[PDB]
Every structure is written in structure tokens, then in C-alpha cells.
Design a binder for this molecule. Structure first.
Ligand SMILES: NC(=O)c1ccc[n+]([C@@H]2O[C@H](COP(=O)([O-])OP(=O)(O)OC[C@H]3O[C@@H](n4cnc5c(N)ncnc54)[C@H](OP(=O)(O)O)[C@@H]3O)[C@@H](O)[C@H]2O)c1
Length: 174
């Protein structure tokens, strides 16, 4: 399989990265501090966000909505890439716009696809629902994310356009 980029090196990023390496992807991490990488897998490459962006066409945004802001200055080197929003909020109606729609405007030249938000960090390793709700405004971007979902052992369901994102984000809260 090809290359995938994971922005962020926390619980979700690490867990997905490891699973993706195990399924045959090459993985590149984007990080604020790529000189700290002890807990990251020897097979992944670890770079600054700007450099990680240019290494792949698919970028998993393993960051919380609260720290999306840095993407605004990168939005030029994210042009034409797939950006997977995996985010949840801590509580219902915490924001008037869906996180994935907010990202879509922070980065107007990327194709945003919502996916993976209902998978717990480390559930891909423990082998303990396989369903993944996917939405987005571009079918080529969505189909690419759905293929990733299947290669990881998951069952993706196309819920429509990015307007479906709010309900997908609400799902683990309710
Ligand atoms: N944890 C879960 O079980 C889970 C499940 C489903 C979905 N998600 C979603 O996955 C995303 C990441 O969650 P997490 O649990 O992995 O969060 P986390 O452990 O706190 O990691 C967040 C990552 O954000 C990056 N980041 C970029 N800018 C940051 C800033 N200004 N402040 C702090 N971190 C910054 C950091 O990577 P660097 O330091 O390398 O820059 C950090 O490792 C969230 O959107 C969450 O809702 C999480």
C-alpha cells in the first residue's frame, strides 16, 4: 500500500500509526517536536508538520479541534490533499459548526473527509463495532478513505456529504 501521513503523535495517532504500519502502509508523523519520538514506531518517519504534509496525499488529523488553528498557515501546502477529520467533542452541541466543516474552511483547498471518530485509541490493537461512518463532499476522496478503512479490518458506511458530519460527531456522545 501507499504512504499515509498522521498529524499528531498522541494516543490516537500512535495507535492508528502502528496499525497502519502493521497493515503494510508507510507512515509519516507530523509533530510540533519531531526530536521527541521515543514512544513512536521505528518504522514511521517523524517530521515537522510542513514537511510531513508534502510526503503524502492522505493526512489523518490526529489533533483535537481546539488546536486546528496551525493548519491556517499550512493551508497552501495542504492543497489538493485528503484530510481525515477523526475528532470528537467532549460534549453535545459544544460548537455550532461540525469540526469537519470548521476544518474545511480552515483549509479550503483540501478535501475533508470525516471518518474513524467512533474508534477508541488502542481498539485496533486489542481487537475489541467494526463500523465506520464516512462523509464528505468529494467521492474520490471518500472512496480513498473507505479503502483505508477496509484495509484496517473495518466496515465503512458512506453517510453522504460533509453536512452529515455533525451527526457523526454526536454519535459517540449519545
Ligand atoms: N483518544 C481516543 O480514544 C480517540 C478516539 C477517537 C477519536 N479521537 C480523536 O483523535 C484526535 C487526537 O486525540 P488524542 O487522544 O490522540 O489526543 P492527544 O493524545 O492529546 O494528542 C493530540 C496531539 O495533537 C498534537 N498537537 C498539535 N498541536 C497541538 C497543540 N497546540 N497542543 C496539544 N497538542 C497538539 C500533538 O502532537 P505533537 O505534539 O507531536 O505535535 C498531540 O500528540 C482528537 O481529535 C480526538 O477527538 C481520539
Amino acid at each position: 500500500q501507499g504512504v499515509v501521513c498522521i498529524f499528531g503523535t498522541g494516543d490516537f495517532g500512535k495507535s492508528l500509526g502502528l496499525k497502519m504500519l502493521q497493515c503494510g502502509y508507510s507512515v509519516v508523523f507530523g509533530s510540533r517536536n519531531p526530536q521527541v519520538s521515543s514512544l513512536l514506531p521505528r518504522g514511521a518517519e517523524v517530521l515537522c508538520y510542513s514537511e510531513a504534509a508534502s510526503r503524502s496525499d492522505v493526512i489523518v488529523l490526529a489533533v483535537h479541534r481546539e488546536h486546528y488553528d496551525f493548519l491556517a498557515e499550512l493551508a497552501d501546502s495542504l492543497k489538493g490533499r485528503v484530510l481525515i477529520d477523526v475528532s470528537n467533542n467532549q460534549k453535545m452541541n459544544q460548537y455550532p459548526e461540525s469540526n469537519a466543516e470548521y476544518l474545511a474552511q480552515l483549509v479550503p483547498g483540501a478535501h475533508v473527509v470525516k471518518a474513524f471518530n467512533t474508534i477508541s485509541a488502542w481498539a485496533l490493537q486489542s481487537g475489541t463495532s467494526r463500523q465506520v461512518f464516512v462523509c464528505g463532499n468529494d467521492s474520490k476522496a471518500k472512496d480513498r478513505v473507505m479503502d483505508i478503512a477496509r484495509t484496517l479490518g473495518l466496515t465503512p458506511l458512506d453517510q453522504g456529504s460533509l453536512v452529515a458530519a455533525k451527526e457523526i460527531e454526536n454519535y459517540p456522545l449519545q
